Every structure is written in structure tokens, then in C-alpha cells.
């Protein structure tokens, strides 16, 4: 994600504001980072109670695609 | 351009000393092997025109290429071979090594 955001930002001038594609790439990077930090959350509380770990995993499976679709819809409706 | 071969005649003065300063040319990548001086005539739809030709024969150097792109290939293939000494029980190390070498 970070390398796609940098390569894409090499084709444009040094514009000081946040374009729309920059906002989309920063949202995608936030989603990825959150996925990694949710695996780290699970890894941390794993030995103490694996039930909460499997639960959190189910909740993540259910609610990453939902929140991502909601963000995607609000994005494509604010700009279009 | 304008004058055909019955109006003008081209020739080198000396026929071997007409072109000087070649042995002093240093090129960062090539090397002038030799040069030839040719005198001929060309024929177009409008007439036959005189022509001279100064043809260099540049030979490309190889040291930079060895140091830049042949050595890394050999070292990456050797880094792929090292995966043979790792025991077959470690499946996350040999995959890692081989895959990375392929990508490189």
C-alpha cells in the first residue's frame, strides 16, 4: 500500500493539499494497518483466553468488509 | 544536395590523414576499434551524386555490465542453491528463500 501511494504520487507535482485519490489510498492504508493491529490484538490475548480470540476473528471477518463497503460508498457518493 | 556528379567531385584530402583526432576520443562505454573512409556515388531519381562516408566501429566495454548485472544474477542463483542444505522439515525457510530468489 505504501509503495503504491508513493509511486502514484511521483507522477504529479508537489501539490500541498490532499487529492481524492490520496484520500482513497490513505483509507485503504488505514484498513490494512487496522487488520494488522487486530491480528496483533489477537496474538496478545491469545494465551489468556482463546475464546475471545476466535470471537474477535469472527467479528473481524464480519465487520471489515462491511465498514470497508460503507467507506467506499460514502467516498464514491461524495466525489461523484 | 544540389549538384550532381557532373558538377562537383568529393574526395578526402590525403585519403588517410583526412580524418584526425580519432585515437584521442575516449568514450565512457565503447572503444573505437577502427574507422574507414569510403568514396562512392549514389543514384537518386534526379541524378547521381557524390558521397563520402566516415564509418567508426565502436566495441562496447564489458566491465560495467559484469559488475552491475551479471554478478547479482550469479549470487542470487547461489542464494537459491543454499536452500538445499536446509533440512526438508523447515517448510517456511526453503519456500521463503526460493520464492524471494524467483522474485529477484
Amino acid at each position: 500500500m505504501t509503495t503504491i501511494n508513493t509511486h502514484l504520487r511521483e507522477t504529479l507535482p508537489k501539490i500541498p493539499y490532499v487529492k481524492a485519490i490520496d484520500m482513497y489510498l490513505m483509507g485503504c492504508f488505514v484498513f490494512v494497518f487496522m487488520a494488522l493491529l487486530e491480528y496483533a490484538l489477537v496474538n496478545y490475548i491469545f494465551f489468556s483466553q482463546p475464546a475471545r480470540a476466535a470471537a474477535i476473528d469472527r467479528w473481524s471477518r464480519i465487520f471489515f468488509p462491511v465498514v470497508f463497503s460503507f467507506f467506499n460508498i460514502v467516498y464514491w457518493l461524495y466525489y461523484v | 544536395y544540389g549538384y550532381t556528379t557532373d558538377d562537383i567531385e568529393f574526395y578526402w584530402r590525403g585519403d588517410d590523414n583526412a580524418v584526425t583526432g580519432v585515437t584521442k576520443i575516449e568514450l565512457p562505454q565503447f572503444s573505437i576499434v577502427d574507422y574507414k573512409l569510403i568514396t562512392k556515388k549514389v543514384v537518386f531519381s534526379t541524378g547521381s551524386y557524390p558521397r563520402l562516408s566516415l564509418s567508426f566501429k565502436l566495441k562496447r566495454n564489458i566491465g560495467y555490465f559484469i559488475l552491475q548485472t551479471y554478478m547479482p544474477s550469479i549470487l542470487i542463483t547461489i542464494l537459491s542453491w543454499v536452500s538445499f542444505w536446509i533440512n526438508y522439515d523447515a517448510s517456511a525457510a526453503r519456500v521463503a528463500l526460493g520464492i524471494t530468489t524467483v522474485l529477484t
Binding site: 505504501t2 508513493t6 504520487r9 507535482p13 508537489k14 501539490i15 500541498p16 493539499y17 490532499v18 490520496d22 492504508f29 494497518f33 494488522l36 493491529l37 496483533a40 496474538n43 496478545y44 491469545f46 494465551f47 | 517456511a92
Partner: protein
């Protein structure tokens, strides 16, 4: 923007502004092709330069600029800070997962290296250190220190696990506060100017 006469010394051709010197150089309202900087104001002046040929009148005009930091923030400071955070994430992982923490450390060091390279390319090939260079150096030091701390933890694991857990639980608090303090100091001392 200095302009003077050629071939005509001061005893022959003297230059002068046509209005009050503060009102001679005028800039159009919509005439700003500056995408990176920000034009603040003009400032004119008139002097006399000596030379080997004669004394010439020289009119000077300074356009004061001020760089906009938005693009550099977005493309250097956010990736550096995020890499540092991703590096400090390696402290909350358990001590049994060695490959995970090793990957964290190595990839963060690689990311910081490539970030330093891409950040130094934008500027001219200058031979001193800028502010962004100091920021990137400090972030590199932080990620390298995180990796060294993990190595120490792994070295003390299975021999003195109490000491390992102690230094890990201490580094879960020592790195983020130190990074926050450094950020505050850096931004405060560089935005006041």
C-alpha cells in the same frame, strides 16, 4: 531580481523607479503559478556596484517566499511516523513468536532506508543536513533501537525470562513516550521560526 545597464556607467545612465519605490513592482492578483511556495511580498532597492569597467547603477527586487509543508508532511512525515509505530508494534507480540518480531524489525529498517532515499532525492544535491534529514535520522534510530531491544529480549529468553519480560514491559512504554517527546520538541522548535 537585479537589473542594470550594460556599457553605460553611472555618469551616463541612472535608473530610478517611476512611482514610489514601494508601488513600482506590482504583482497581478491571479498571477501566481506557484504550486509549492507562497509569495508574501516584494521589496525593491537601488544601489551602485563598482567594477573593473566602471560604476553601474543596480536596481534590486526581492520576492519573499514561504514553502508549503503539506506535501512533504503527507509523503515523508506520515510514512516515517507510521513505520515507527509499526515497529513499536513488535513489542506487544509474545516472546514465543520469534519470526514475527524478526520480520517486523527487518522490514521496518528496510522501509526507513528506502524512505530516507526517496526523501533525499527531491532536494538538490546539497552537502549539509536539512530538518527532514534529522527527522528521518531520529526515526531510523528509533526503529533500529526497537530491533536491538527485541534481539536483547530474545538473548535473555530461556535463560532469565524474568529480566526479558521486564525489559519488554518497560519498552512497551519507553519507546512511545520518547517518540512523542521528540515529536513535540522537533515540531515546536521548527514551527516557531
Amino acid at each position: 531580481l537585479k537589473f542594470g545597464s550594460y556599457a553605460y556607467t553611472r555618469a551616463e545612465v541612472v535608473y530610478e523607479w517611476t512611482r514610489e519605490p514601494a508601488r513600482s513592482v506590482v504583482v497581478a492578483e491571479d498571477g501566481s503559478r506557484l504550486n509549492q511556495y507562497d509569495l508574501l511580498g516584494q521589496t525593491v532597492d537601488s544601489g551602485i556596484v563598482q567594477s573593473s569597467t566602471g560604476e553601474y547603477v543596480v536596481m534590486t527586487t526581492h520576492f519573499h517566499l514561504k514553502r508549503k509543508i503539506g506535501y512533504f508532511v503527507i509523503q515523508t512525515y506520515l510514512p516515517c511516523i507510521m513505520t515507527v509505530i509499526l515497529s513499536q508494534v513488535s513489542f506487544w507480540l509474545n516472546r514465543e513468536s520469534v519470526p514475527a518480531r524478526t520480520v517486523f524489525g527487518v522490514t521496518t529498517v528496510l522501509t526507513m532506508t528506502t524512505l530516507s532515499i526517496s526523501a533525499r532525492n527531491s532536494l538538490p544535491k546539497v552537502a549539509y543536513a536539512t530538518a527532514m534529514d534529522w527527522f528521518i535520522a531520529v526515526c531510523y534510530a528509533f526503529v533500529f533501537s526497537a530491533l536491538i531491544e527485541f534481539a536483547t529480549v530474545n538473548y535473555f529468553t530461556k535463560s532469565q525470562p524474568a529480566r526479558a519480560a521486564k525489559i519488554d514491559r518497560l519498552s512497551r512504554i519507553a519507546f512511545p513516550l520518547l517518540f512523542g517527546i521528540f515529536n513535540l520538541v522537533y515540531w515546536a522548535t521548527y514551527l516557531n521560526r
